[PDB]
Design a protein around this ligand. Structure first.
Ligand SMILES: [Fe+2]
Length: 590
């Protein structure tokens, strides 16, 4: 008798997404250590439904190793999303078999129980054959393809339809009123949509011939400009990557100053790289609209770097690399698959629907040189820009909140790594982990030595760091650069997507008219009702108590971080909440 909620006791859970149900014939087989069962027929599996069956075997099978599912068409094929199967066996044991896959009827689906296993744990043929065939199937279905010259390699799929079925689908107001203010312009380099470019200047670049006389009115400590550099109070945003893209663009240098109120404000702007009479150093002491238009041009450049580099290349395409490497080299039963699969959810499909729908390609090609592993290790990357000291640079909330979430994910990956890897040798000898890391280096990052990506991982520490890169990039870093886009780029003058006139080549000439003639004549910033936020793991790939306790500790820690950020934001002029963990999605899904 069959009991449907909404010998062996078999429970089948159908997904809650639409079209998850099927009307087709479902056959179940049990593979035990002492024999296999005949194919049993189950009779429809509706969306959200849990169907339970009582199955009597012809013989005693021993400990159940695998469950097998075949979907024969009843009339027309009907894709079926299977969440999991469980068994209560004749010997009283309860065994859970995580699936979370679409079943199209094209092949048999064979599931391990949910206890996570390294290759080293699988010594009987039944299990070694399953694992080997799974990886061979994965590496035929998930392949590398060069979409555009020089890009990280992506998925071998022209259309979203061609992907394997499993991986298919107030601040605005403030900007409007204050976008002309030097303070607001400076604030965004630390806490707007693109807070990753500014760095501490340690000597003035020869290509920016600014003098203490030019900026004396902006300096407030009775020091020369070169003395202020040496005291660490001068910062720079340099868009030289835009230089040499041939749809009008510039490649500005923007010099900034930490004033006595400890706020970083712009003090000089050169709109192109090569200094000259027709490339002036604009200053806040210039005519109102000279300085205003210089700033708009920097806002335009920051926008384009942000869209193509900060966002697309360094979070979307990087996350897709990690996701393809995971599907190709880690079987479902591997603990790093179980950990990472929720953080690459939808990443490949999002990128694929974008690709199907010149100068932007060059920007990616030029930024590949800086797409390093160290650049993705958030604490080290902050320090490499000289921005680490909170005593020195006190209003860098992207840094402060990133550090806490980076450290929370690091704590979690370490606990997980220590449950499943007893020492450093087990990490080094894990052949699937080594092939996963190697695919990233060789295929995703093209094998470029200067990427700094590890060729192998040989300790628990190093593996924890590497998993934190993957998870932080897909979750926190993506949210910080994606969800402030409506706040900061919905007022066009603060973020022009195109420019209709060339940059001004002299002072005292631009009018409010010329500013209007230069400027042009929300989708990606929204969350969804389904949205899964950092540490929500409804798909139970892990079923074991130790890792489940580690996940609960991870959530509690993220909850403490939410409270810290909320109490910090209570006292702030303009709250920074993009890195509050209740707002950080698990993955790149938008
Ligand atoms: Fe995104």
């Amino acid at each position: 008798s069959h009991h449907h909620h909404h010998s062996y006791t078999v429970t089948v859970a159908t997904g809650s997404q639409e079209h998850a149900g099927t009307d087709d014939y479902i056959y179940l087989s049990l593979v035990g250590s002492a024999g296999c069962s005949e194919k049993h027929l189950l009779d429809s599996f509706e969306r959200g439904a849990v169907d339970s069956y009582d199955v009597t075997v012809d013989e005693e099978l021993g400990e159940i190793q695998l469950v097998r599912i075949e979907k024969r068409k009843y009339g027309s094929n009907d894709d079926w999303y299977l969440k999991y199967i469980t068994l209560k066996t004749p010997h009283g044991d309860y065994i859970e078999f995580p699936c979370y896959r679409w079943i199209t009827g094209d092949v048999e689906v064979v599931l391990r129980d949910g206890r996570a296993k390294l290759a080293r744990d699988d010594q009987i043929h039944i299990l070694k054959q399953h694992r080997r065939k799974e990886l061979e199937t994965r590496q035929k279905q998930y392949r590398w393809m060069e979409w555009n010259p020089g890009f990280p390699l992506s998925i071998d799929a022209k259309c979203h339809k061609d992907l394997p079925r499993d991986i298919q689908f107030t601040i605005s107001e403030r900007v409007m009123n204050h976008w002309q203010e030097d303070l607001m312009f400076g604030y965004q380099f630390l806490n707007g949509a693109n807070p990753v470019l500014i760095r501490r200047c340690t000597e003035l670049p020869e290509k920016l011939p600014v003098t203490t006389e030019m900026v004396e009115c902006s300096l407030e400590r009775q020091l020369s400009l070169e003395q202020e550099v040496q005291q660490g109070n001068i910062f720079i945003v340099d868009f030289e990557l835009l230089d040499g893209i041939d749809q009008f663009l510039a490649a500005p240098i923007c010099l900034l100053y930490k004033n006595l109120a400890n706020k970083i404000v712009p003090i000089a702007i050169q709109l192109n790289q090569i200094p000259g009479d027709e490339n002036p150093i604009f200053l806040p002491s210039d005519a109102k609209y000279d300085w205003l238009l210089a700033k708009i041009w920097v806002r335009s450049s920051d926008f384009h770097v942000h869209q193509t580099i900060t966002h697309l290349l360094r979070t979307h395409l990087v996350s897709e690399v990690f996701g393809i490497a995971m599907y190709r080299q880690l079987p479902a039963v591997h603990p790093i698959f179980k950990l990472l699969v929720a953080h690459v959810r939808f990443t490949i499909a999002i990128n694929t629907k974008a690709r199907e729908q010149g100068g932007h390609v060059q920007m990616v090609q030029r930024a590949m040189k800086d797409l390093t592993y160290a650049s993705l290790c958030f604490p080290e990357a902050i320090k490499a820009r000289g921005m680490e000291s909170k005593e020195d640079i006190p209003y860098y909330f992207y840094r402060d909140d990133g550090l806490l979430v980076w450290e929370a994910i690091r704590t979690f990956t370490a606990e997980v790594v220590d449950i499943y890897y007893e020492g450093d040798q087990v990490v080094e000898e894990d052949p699937e982990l080594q092939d996963f890391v190697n695919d990233v280096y060789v295929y995703g990052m093209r094998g470029r030595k200067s990427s700094g990506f590890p060729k192998s991982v040989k300790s628990r520490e190093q593996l924890s760091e590497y998993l934190t890169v993957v998870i932080f990039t897909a979750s926190a870093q993506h949210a910080a650069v994606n969800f402030g886009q409506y706040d900061w780029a919905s007022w066009i003058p603060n973020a022009p997507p195109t420019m209709r006139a060339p940059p001004p080549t002299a002072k005292g000439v631009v009018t409010i008219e010329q500013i209007v003639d230069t400027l042009p004549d929300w989708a990606l910033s929204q969350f969804q009702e389904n949205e899964l936020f950092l540490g929500m793991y409804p798909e139970e790939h892990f079923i074991e108590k130790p890792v489940k306790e580690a996940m609960a500790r991870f959530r509690k820690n993220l909850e403490a971080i939410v409270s810290v950020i909320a109490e910090r934001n209570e006292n702030l002029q303009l709250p920074y909440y993009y890195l509050s963990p209740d707002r950080i999605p698990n993955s790149v899904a938008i």
